[PDB]
Amino acid sequence: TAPNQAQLRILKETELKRVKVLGSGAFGTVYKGIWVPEGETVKIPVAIKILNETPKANVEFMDEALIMASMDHPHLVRLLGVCLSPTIQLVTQLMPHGCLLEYVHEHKDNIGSQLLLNWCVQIAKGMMYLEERRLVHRDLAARNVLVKSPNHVKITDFGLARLLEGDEKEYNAGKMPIKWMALECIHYRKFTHQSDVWSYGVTIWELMTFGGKPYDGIPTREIPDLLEKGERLPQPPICTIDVYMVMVKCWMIDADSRPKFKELAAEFSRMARDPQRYLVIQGDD
Ligand SMILES: [Mn+2]
């Protein structure tokens, strides 16, 4: 593997102004901010993520920062962006419209097939680049896709992301939710680009259901057995069989036979050219 000479930019605190909290909870807190780069005049709208005040959490936050600093893809969040005082804070370009999961909930009456299919394309496009860099996300979900503008989304939350090396074709070990993980990850902790493909299935299913909760009301405990029996997520009411089939191909038992991100991008691209062919939504063309 080629050596990684990405440049990590260390930001002085005086360069950053925190304006508003965007979100908080167990994971830590994200702010909206202005960043003025040393020593320029331009004001860059910014997201500033810190941990809440609680062993390996700081080290891993930095690992996450390294990943975001090493890539330049239109559909992957890029670090700007690290400040150290008074605690670690990751600084990324502001995504005005928040996370995609909430976005599709709020605007459900307003979202057409064109945007939904396009999101399938972009997310698959981002994941594609991750494959080329041999990075397994391990935690792909609609809550980890952010919205820059209606027709431009980015994958984020690389905190559990792992870089495959040498001959390694899987990663073995975090707390990504079981309802989005591949059956072989549940059983053998066998994380690959192909398990990510499963997660993508669930992700795009969250979209077609306008922020549906997968297997809703079924305890996590019962999930492994549900999926052993062959049960999968239902056909969303807007989905033609063409679209659902793609989802079902991602949830097949043989990981290797699953479609690849490269193939999923090309396929949803084909659908994107005639959207109303493929998703059937009230009030749309
Ligand atoms: Mn539960």
Swiss-Prot record:
Phosphotyrosine modifications at: 171
Highest taxon listed in the record's lineage: Eukaryota
Active-site annotation: 139
Residues of the full protein shown: 703 to 991 of 1308
Effect of residue 160 to R: Strongly reduced autophosphorylation
Protein name: ERBB4 intracellular domain
Effect of residue 241 to R: Constitutively autophosphorylated
Effect of residue 168 to K: No effect on kinase activity
Variant or mutagenesis effect after changing residue 150 to Q: No effect on kinase activity
UniProt-reported outcome of changing residue 49 to R: Abolishes kinase activity. Abolishes phosphorylation, proteolytic processing and nuclear localization
Subcellular localization: Nucleus; Mitochondrion
Reported impact of residue 157 to Y: Loss of kinase activity
Occurrences of domain Protein kinase (ranges): 16-279
Residues where ATP binds: 22-30, 49, 93-95, 139-144
